[PDB]
Structure 1
Amino acid sequence: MPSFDFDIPRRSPQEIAKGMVAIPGGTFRMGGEDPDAFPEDGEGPVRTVRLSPFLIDRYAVSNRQFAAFVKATGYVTDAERYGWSFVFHAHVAPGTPVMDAVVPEAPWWVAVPGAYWKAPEGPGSSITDRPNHPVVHVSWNDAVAYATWAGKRLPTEAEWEMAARGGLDQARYPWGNELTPRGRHRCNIWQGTFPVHDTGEDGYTGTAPVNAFAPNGYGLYNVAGNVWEWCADWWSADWHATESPATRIDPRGPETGTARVTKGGSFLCHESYCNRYRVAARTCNTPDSSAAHTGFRCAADP
């Protein structure tokens, strides 16, 4: 937890819980066993995990909500402090300069000076037509800052995954095992040929409003696709392979690490590249980093 220069407004439990669903205490099977999963992701093993009851946001935190936080606190995000953030190449306007540097493994990501949550494609862009889209260009530090100010916290990975699974046992996606059941789109991911052309068959070639598509069985929206969502846990591909109370009862993840867990996949994910919009999928990013496809939702103790 970093240092914060704001204070926390007094709020009633009903105000905090608005927009949240109450997940009952219980067990669930976390993890996955897809043979094509990338070993370095540590999706396995599948294990029974017991969680205490918690609340979780039905929606990722929106631009309008993050703007309220910034209005109240003057909070300055990491992307503003560093002066740049990651934007998908095809979304940068031609007259907007970018840094000449490349992400070796993912050259479709460009570092854009001046890209941040209120200007998500760089200077000249805005969020005036996206108030109910998930806030992006928020680092893990920014996410924990908002959640703290909001009277909440980030979910653990296990809380995130229990809620995202929506009461189904070991299904592939939040809603079941078929990606487009009866040909209906259920999430905002990539269609077409990644990274060359997104056909937008699901309606969106960038972020969608936080209430797009149907909820899962617990009432959560866009747990799969739309934006990656920061979780509290440090990233490890093996800590959770241990079988102990620490890893199976309200697991908090490893005590140390270098990157924090992100869940759920994004509008950029595709079967032919990452296949990371399955509910067991997982990756990470370093806590000071920010990108146009990464946001968060909050959780809270009851």
Structure 2
Amino acid sequence: ARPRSTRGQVRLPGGEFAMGDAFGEGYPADGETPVHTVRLRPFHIDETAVTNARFAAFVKATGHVTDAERFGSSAVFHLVVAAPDADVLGSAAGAPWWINVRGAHWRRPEGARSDITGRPNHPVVHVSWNDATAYARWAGKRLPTEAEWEYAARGGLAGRRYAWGDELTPGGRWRCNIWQGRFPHVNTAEDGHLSTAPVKSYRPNGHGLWNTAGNVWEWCSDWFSPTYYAESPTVDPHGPGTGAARVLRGGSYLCHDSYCNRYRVAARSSNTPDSSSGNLGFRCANDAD
């Protein structure tokens, strides 16, 4: 436990909120219901997802090798692949818009022919749950619990669909980075961004958190279970004791209503802890006092 650091974090009061899909419109397999009352002690949470600049200081200081560098490849969205054809290990099965690209990792997130020199303030991607919790440890932080993330993401509002309210595009304007157009072939970039956006795009929510909806998925501490909500403690729920996949929240720049609207503040997803991809990052937290 390195010397605790609240740099770039806001302190949120905590208290009691209604966690879950207040509209019963979610995906049944994800267990967004029942809406259940949770009580959180005050905590800190990152204002933004972790940046390339910050994650790079972590690697410079610890020589950490990310799971995507060990496995040898990470998933890249097919429209933005920037690699020699030798490196394309072919479409991922079950979702052919994801190309397994050899050499694709956080420093070269579209493949061997890309860099992140122009994107220090973009969220870091190609980071697994292991890479995420490693960084947090080194940085004097931890990952948020799922409940901490949703409460922080709701921004002091109760029972809303999104971090800012219930209209997806208030005033007919975009305030988050997801997908527009015909997925997976055409992205019209109405929201300003094809792939990742800078961490402080648009505007923060009620608690000061930028881009909890969209941009990239965000690792949480919990194991995923679609029945945790109906069995949850009331105080500081940490998730079930074991599981198959760790929780992801927020959605990403690929989310679209046609197949995955998980940018809803109550939507949930998961993935195996050593998974990485070009739309998956994280933000840290910490206890208070």
| TM-score of the aligned structures, taking structure 1 as reference length | 0.92
Structure 2, unmatched stretches of 5+, are none
Kept in 1: contact 2:68–2:276 (CA 8 A):
yes
1:38 has 2:24 as partner: no
Alpha-carbon distance in structure 2 between the residues aligned to 1:204 and 1:81: 30
Residue 92 of structure 2 is matched in structure 1 by 102
Alpha-carbon distance in structure 1 between the residues aligned to 2:285 and 2:20: 20
Residue 151 of structure 2 is matched in structure 1 by 162
Give how far 1:56 is off.
Answer: 0.2
User: Hey, which bits of structure 1, 4+ residues long, moved more than 6 A?
Assistant: none
Of residues 151, 160, 166, the one that matches 1:177 is 166
Give how far 1:24 is off.
Answer: 0.6
Residue 257 of structure 2 is matched in structure 1 by 271
Kept in 2: contact 1:240–1:253 (CA 8 A):
no
Alpha-carbon distance in structure 1 between the residues aligned to 2:241 and 2:83: 44
**Secondary structure at the residue paired with 1:86?**
strand
Of residues 54, 66, 81, the one that matches 1:65 is 54
Alpha-carbon distance in structure 2 between the residues aligned to 1:108 and 1:34: 31
One-letter amino acid matched to 1:120: P
Deviations 1:40-67, CA, capped at 9 Å, x for gaps? 1111111110001100000000000000
The structure-2 alpha-carbon separation of the partners of 1:203 and 1:101, relative to structure 1 and needing over 3 Å to count, comes to closer
Q: Superposed, which structure 2 residues align to 1:110-129 within 5 Å?
A: 110-129=99-118
Number of equivalenced pairs: 287
**Secondary structure at the residue paired with 1:261?**
strand
Give how far 1:249 is off.
Answer: 1.1
Alpha-carbon distance in structure 1 between the residues aligned to 2:208 and 2:225: 29
Give how far 1:95 is off.
Answer: 3.2
Alpha-carbon distance in structure 2 between the residues aligned to 1:253 and 1:44: 15
Residue 284 of structure 1 is matched in structure 2 by 270
Kept in 2: contact 1:120–1:126 (CA 8 A):
yes
1:153 has 2:139 as partner: no
Residue 3 of structure 1 is matched in structure 2 by none
One-letter amino acid matched to 1:204: H
Kept in 1: contact 2:218–2:280 (CA 8 A):
yes
The structure-2 alpha-carbon separation of the partners of 1:141 and 1:94, relative to structure 1 and needing over 3 Å to count, comes to closer
| TM-score of the aligned structures, taking structure 2 as reference length | 0.96
Give how far 1:280 is off.
Answer: 0.1
One-letter amino acid matched to 2:168: L
Alpha-carbon distance in structure 2 between the residues aligned to 1:230 and 1:48: 22
Alpha-carbon distance in structure 2 between the residues aligned to 1:208 and 1:100: 26
1:141 has 2:127 as partner: no
Of residues 38, 43, 64, the one that matches 1:54 is 43
Give how far 1:281 is off.
Answer: 0.5
Residue 208 of structure 1 is matched in structure 2 by 197
One-letter amino acid matched to 1:264: G
Alpha-carbon distance in structure 2 between the residues aligned to 1:183 and 1:220: 22
Residue 4 of structure 1 is matched in structure 2 by none
Give how far 1:189 is off.
Answer: 0.2
**Secondary structure at the residue paired with 2:38?**
strand
**Secondary structure at the residue paired with 2:89?**
coil
Alpha-carbon distance in structure 2 between the residues aligned to 1:38 and 1:262: 15
One-letter amino acid matched to 1:281: A
The structure-2 alpha-carbon separation of the partners of 1:124 and 1:93, relative to structure 1 and needing over 3 Å to count, comes to closer
1:250 has 2:259 as partner: no
Alpha-carbon distance in structure 2 between the residues aligned to 1:209 and 1:149: 23
Give how far 1:271 is off.
Answer: 1.1
Kept in 2: contact 1:86–1:110 (CA 8 A):
yes
The structure-2 alpha-carbon separation of the partners of 1:214 and 1:101, relative to structure 1 and needing over 3 Å to count, comes to closer
1:24 has 2:13 as partner: yes
Structure 1, unmatched stretches of 5+, are 1-6
Give how far 1:18 is off.
Answer: 2.2
Alpha-carbon distance in structure 2 between the residues aligned to 1:189 and 1:170: 22
CA-atom RMSD, angstroms?
1.3
Give how far 1:33 is off.
Answer: 4.1
**Secondary structure at the residue paired with 2:90?**
coil
Q: Percent identity?
A: 63
